[PDB]
């Protein structure tokens, strides 16, 4: 099972930083009882010790934390109005300009690996990524929901 609800998708304005993104994406997870109440702080410190993915044309980050902080599997998606720098996950000096954020709150290791594999395929689909930057929240929710449905 993976919980993905319509309010788990949102657009974010141009004046948010890395920490505001994490907290904004975590708050719906917090409010539905999917993660521990301080889940956001643990994502921030795990990220500082990085989930930025340099892919064309849209940079992606996958912030998350230890499965022990997840109560029920969920995903929270954020579309950034302006690119925001995430440090490369591989360990390259240049920061990744990110516009799409997949917050992963997965507690089950087999789901984590399946979702990371699905994300890897998705972010190499340039038509899909372009669509993410122009669809509305409901359309994004329906598109990703269908893809999470096909995953399981």
């Amino acid at each position, epitope marked *: 099972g993976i919980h993905f609800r319509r309010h788990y998708v949102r657009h974010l304005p141009k004046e948010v930083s890395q920490n505001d993104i994490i907290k904004a994406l975590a708050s719906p997870l917090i409010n539905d009882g999917m993660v521990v109440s301080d889940f956001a702080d643990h994502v921030i410190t795990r990220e500082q010790n990085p989930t930025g993915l340099p892919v064309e044309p849209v940079g992606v980050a996958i912030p998350h934390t*230890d499965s022990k902080y997840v109560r029920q599997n969920a995903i929270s998606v954020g579309i950034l109005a302006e690119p925001v720098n995430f440090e490369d*996950a591989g360990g390259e000096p240049d920061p990744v300009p990110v516009r799409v954020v997949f917050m992963l709150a997965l*507690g*089950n290791w*087999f789901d*984590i*690996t*399946n979702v*990371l*594999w699905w994300i890897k395929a998705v972010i190499q689909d340039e038509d899909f990524m372009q669509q993410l930057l122009v669809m509305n929240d409901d359309e994004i929710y329906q598109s990703i929901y269908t893809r999470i449905s096909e995953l399981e």
Partner: antibody
Amino acid sequence: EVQLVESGGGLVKPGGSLRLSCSASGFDFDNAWMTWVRQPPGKGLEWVGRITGPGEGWSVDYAAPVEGRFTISRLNSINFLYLEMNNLRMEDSGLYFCARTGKYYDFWSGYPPGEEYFQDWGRGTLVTVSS
Amino acid sequence: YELTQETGVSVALGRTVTITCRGDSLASHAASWYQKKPGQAPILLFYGKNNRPSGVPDRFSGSASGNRASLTISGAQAEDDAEYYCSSRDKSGSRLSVFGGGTKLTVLS
């Protein structure tokens, strides 16, 4: 600082049953995956089975020569891992090790479900199945 | 065996030696490597792409390509005389694990 103290090994008859125990200490056991591995006398290591954590519902996977006869369980309150062995056979004889089990998945090169690796081992407890 | 290892290899003191693990599941899954001496608990030597547990000597290194995993020991020391085991999935996408048959490393001591 990790210790994994297996016990319960001994002489048992073919067709009999035996329970092995492993007392774990020095790490967060509630969230750890745990594996049993055996070594028949004179042979190599053989993976027996592994029990997952709470996020996986404590699900268990077993090797083919053992599935349907062995049961792996755990009691997190006392940091114990168990191996219940039924309908034992001569070829089940050997040294049984518990192993703290880590999980690995490389984003760009990985394939589900990643890989498990065995980061801490006990010394093992010896099982001898004989008539 | 899903994972095939050489049975035995020799190396003079201070030489480099490589031992290998081969199987179809290695094209999809990294191998991990273990050292075991007579009468003693195995120890993990490394795992994943470029990961080595703290305390494991720098001279133990691993590589991988295609269906092949390799453990390379630089200047072999006397205490490296041991059995070496690789582990990975038994098949691609499997939840089970499996060990290779093990390699006896003799360090000409």
